[PDB]
Each structure stands twice: as C-alpha cells, then as structure tokens.
Amino acid sequence: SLDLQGSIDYSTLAAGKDFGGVYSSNPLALIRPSGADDVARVLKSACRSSNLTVAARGNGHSINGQAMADGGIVLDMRSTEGNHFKILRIGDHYADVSGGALWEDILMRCVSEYGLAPRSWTDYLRLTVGGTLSNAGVSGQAFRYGPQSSNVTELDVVTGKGDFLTCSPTQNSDLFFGALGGLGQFGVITRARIPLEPAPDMVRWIRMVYAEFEDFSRDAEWLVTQPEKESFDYVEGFAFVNSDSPADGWPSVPLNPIHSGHQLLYCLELALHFNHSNSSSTVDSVVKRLIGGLRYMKGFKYEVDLSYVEFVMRVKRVEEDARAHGMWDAPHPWLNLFVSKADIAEFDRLIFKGLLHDGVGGPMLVYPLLRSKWDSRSSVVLPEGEDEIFYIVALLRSNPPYPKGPSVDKLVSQNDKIIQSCIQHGLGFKLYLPHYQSQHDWRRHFGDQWSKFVQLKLAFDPMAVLAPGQKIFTRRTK
Ligand SMILES: *Cc1cc2c(cc1C)nc1c(=O)[nH]c(=O)nc-1n2C[C@H](O)[C@H](O)[C@H](O)COP(=O)(O)OP(=O)(O)OC[C@H]1O[C@@H](n2cnc3c(N)ncnc32)[C@H](O)[C@@H]1O
Ligand SMILES: [N+]
C-alpha cells in the first residue's frame, strides 16, 4: 500500500519542464520514491486507476517532453540515486548502480573508492543510468565498447503493471533487451549492473582540424577500425563554423587561423589513455605512430594532458559557462540522428553544407560508430545497411531566448526541414532520442521492429501507463 507525505528533504523540482524547453506540462504530482518498492507501489496504483499515467524522470535532459506526464504522476528517480551501490569481483569487476544515479557520481565514486570506472560514457555526465540506458548512451568509447546499453549485465525493472523483475540476457531476457533502448515503454529501471575497467591515470586529448569532409570522414573511419592494441581510446568529431564566433566558431576548437572561403570546417577529436608509468616521450611515440598519414591541416593540431576524471568530466566547464550566461535554463531544440555510412557524404552536402553552413550556435557532432557493438536484440533502432560503419550526428542548437534569438516554433520548424530533406532524399537515417506525434510516424521509425515493440508493450505495459511523453502509445482506460 502506497504511503506518502509532503516532501521535506527536497528542493523544488520543475517536473513539468525539461532541458529542451519545447513543451511544458502540469503533472498531478511529483513523487520522490525511496526505491524500487515505492516505484512498484506507484505503478500498481496507477494500473488500478481509470487512466493515470506515470513518467520516470531522470535528470530532466529530454528535449521533447519524453519524461513528462501531463495530468499524471512524475517519479523523481534521483531520490533513489544512492540505492544499490556496490562493487563486486568475479577477476573482472562490476558495479551495481541505481537507475536514478548520475553517471558523474558513478565516475567519481568508482575511481576514488576502487580505481575503477565504467568503460562507455556519455559526453555529459549529469544524466541518469535509467535515462541513458533507455536510449543508448553514446560517446567516443562506443566504437570500442558499444553504447552504454551494450554494457549491462543485469537490470532490476518495475514493469508498467508494477511487477519487480531482475533481468539479464538469460533471465526475463525479453524485458532486459526490451528495456535497453526501449524509451521507458516497458518498465522503470531501478538498478543496473555494469562492467568496470581499471581507470587510466591520464588522457592525451587531441583535436585536429580538417578542411574537407572527405578527408575527415576517411580518417575517422580509419581510426575506429584499427586493432584495439594500436588504437585511440576515444574518437569523436564535429563540424564548426569558419568564423570568430565564441559559440561555435574557431574559438570553440582549441583545448587551452587560415583565411579561406570555407563556411564550415571539421574537427577530429581523439584521446589516448595512459598511466603515470608512461613517459611523455612514450606517449608521444605512440601518438605519432597512430596519426601517421592522417590528412589534418598542419599547424592545427591541439593537444593537452589531463587526468582521466578531468577528461570524462570535460563538459562540466561548458555547463558552468552556460549557467553563468543564463543560457542553461533556456530552450535547447536539439536534433540527434544516426546516418548510414552509405549516405553520410550526401548528408554532409545537403544538411551541413546546404542548410547549416552558418552553424546552429553549438557543436554539430558527427562521427563514426561500429554496428557490431550495438546489440541487435535491444530496442535501439539503427538505419538499415550492413556496412560495419555508421554515423551519429548531433545538432546542439544554442540561441539567446526569443525575441533576442529565434522562437522555439522557428527552431523546431528548422529541425523539421532537416528531417524532411533527408526523407525526400531517401537518406538512410533514424532519429536518436526519436520524437514523433502520430503512431503512423512511429511505425515508420521502428520499421520491421514495430511488431516486436508492440508485443513487448502488451506484455509489460498493456494499459500504456508508463512514459506517455514518448507519445508512442496512448493510455487505455479502466
Ligand atoms: C541535456 C543533455 C543531454 C544529453 C547530453 C548533454 C546534455 C547537456 N549528452 C549526451 C551524450 O553525450 N550522449 C548521449 O547518448 N545522450 C546525451 N544526452 C541525452 C540523454 O541521453 C537524454 O536526455 C536521456 O533522456 C537521458 O537523460 P535523463 O537521465 O535526464 O533522462 P530523462 O530525459 O529524464 O528521461 C528519458 C526518458 O527515459 C525515461 N526514464 C527516465 N528514467 C528512467 C528509468 N530509471 N527507467 C526507465 N525509464 C526511465 C523517461 O521517462 C524518459 O522517457
Ligand atoms: N605528437
């Protein structure tokens, strides 16, 4: 039986808002669950109601209201963030972590308490375990280890019916694989067990500028396809504007220019783990071998050494900056997508060069991934193709709020135009963090994976109580 009191221990949380600032909602209530028991109690009660919906909120970083429950119940999963933490040995190591824990705190705790760390990250660490595992969780390690959803050995899940189940690849495996990349549709992740690696002492962080997309992409693909023993430990890249803009021009590139008609340029971003047992000269020798033959513009290679924790935490500086400029609690109509290797050059021509040649005010990430690291059994949707290589693209728009900058309607319209152009060109792409309004568009997104997705919904959340903000299924009555 669900027993609740007024929240005393907690600061105000705007449960009807998220990072995107595109939508707003008015939940009936915000609940701070103590742990999995409370989550189950809440979902069991929701199932008995005629039409209550429940959204589990991670850290509110959705763009499109995915963690909202207008006229429903929001669970603050961070109130469970301390639950379950442990490190165990089998001599491989694992961590149990709460679904509501921030990746930032997992990094700090694992490194400081055990000299260990997760091996697959997001760029930004104030995201929750459950939140990223429900999507994928992608950064520069994914070419080696796969996304965070490919680095899980166990989940505790409370289903939309309110049932608690421990799941793995071999136990309640339909739920396990369904929840991974499953957009919160089948249950609330209350615990994950994840592999850990010995934490590196240090990182050599490198950025190299490219004039042309062909050179950039060929070199990026080369670097993610080398033997593990002779490879970097992180590969990303981004297009930036050939301008003096502090937001997304040349100032955004160095870690601590040639005058040309280029509208955009490209930056290949690499990192090499090393330990204090390695001399600077040794690291130099390794890097020199690894980048032999690369066609980056001479004179525009930037390098710094920093601790592993500082490198994984590198985006904290960006948040501090934004917050100091009152730009954090503002709209961010970001667009994220996966593009097939076969179509990435046309995507660059049509979208980067064609539509975005003046930039979007923030990073335009683009870098290759390896399909073999993305578990085909999961709910993740990738574009068709069987090139081992595919790409992720992220358009991290940043603008002063209206009327100083464009309206949210305007920006969303621009995002729609990008997607429209890809569709009209028949490009092989899928949205990451997908958002659609009609189920017809959702069926187009899932393609031949749709039947399985609905089957899982019927098995685990038949009344569609859970994650209504994804707008895939509507709440059934009674
Ligand atoms: C805001 C932001 C997001 C972001 C990022 C940088 C910033 C500043 N960098 C990313 C990166 O480098 N790589 C990547 O893959 N994602 C990145 N993101 C996006 C982030 O992944 C998403 O915002 C994602 O949603 C995680 O954020 P968060 O943890 O805050 O979760 P949420 O937005 O509130 O909820 C997402 C959906 O999942 C459901 N949900 C939430 N918690 C659970 C649990 N425990 N179990 C089951 N479902 C859950 C929500 O209801 C919602 O549908
Ligand atoms: N070097």
Residue numbers in the entry: 44 to 133, 136 to 301, 307 to 528
How does the study describe this entry?
In this study, the flax cytosolic cytokinin oxidase/dehydrogenase LuCKX1.1, an enzyme involved in the irreversible degradation of hormones in the cytokinin family, was identified as a potential virulence target of the flax rust effector AvrL567‐A. Cytokinins are responsible for the regulation of cell division and plant development, and have also been implicated in plant immunity. We investigated the interactions between AvrL567‐A and LuCKX1.1, and demonstrated that AvrL567‐A increases the enzymatic activity of LuCKX1.1 in vitro. The crystal structure of LuCKX1.1 was determined, providing insights into the molecular basis of the LuCKX1–AvrL567‐A interaction and the action of the effector on LuCKX1.1 enzymatic activity. The results indicated that LuCKX1.1 preferentially catalyses the oxidative cleavage of 2iP and tZ over the aromatic cytokinin types BA or kinetin.
To obtain insights into the molecular basis of the AvrL567‐A–LuCKX1.1 interaction, the flax LuCKX1.1 protein (residues 44–534) was crystallized. The final refined model of LuCKX1.1 contains residues 44–532. The structure of LuCKX1.1 exhibits a two‐domain topology consisting of a flavin adenine dinucleotide (FAD)‐binding domain and a substrate‐binding domain, which is similar to the known structures of AtCKX7, ZmCKX1, ZmCKX2, ZmCKX4a and ZmCKX4b. LuCKX1.1 contains the FAD co‐factor covalently linked to histidine‐104 (His104) via the 8‐methyl group of the flavin ring in LuCKX1.1. The FAD‐binding domain (residues 44–243 and 478–532) comprises one mixed β‐sheet, one antiparallel β‐sheet and flanking α‐helices. The other domain (residues 244–477) contains an antiparallel β‐sheet surrounded by α‐helices. The residues important for substrate binding identified in the active sites of ZmCKX1 and ZmCKX2 are largely conserved in LuCKX1.1, including aspartic acid‐168 (Asp168), glutamic acid‐281 (Glu281), valine‐365 (Val365), glutamic acid‐369 (Glu369), tryptophan‐384 (Trp384), proline‐413 (Pro413), leucine‐446 (Leu446) and leucine‐483 (Leu483). The iA1.1 clone initially isolated by Y2H screening encodes residues 268–340 of LuCKX1.1, indicating that these 72 residues are sufficient for the interaction with AvrL567‐A. In the crystal structure, this fragment corresponds to two buried β‐strands and two surface‐exposed regions of helices and loops. Surface 1 is right above the opening of the channel through which cytokinins enter the active site. In the high‐resolution crystal structure of LuCKX1.1, the electron density map for the surface 1 region is not well resolved, indicating flexibility in this loop region.
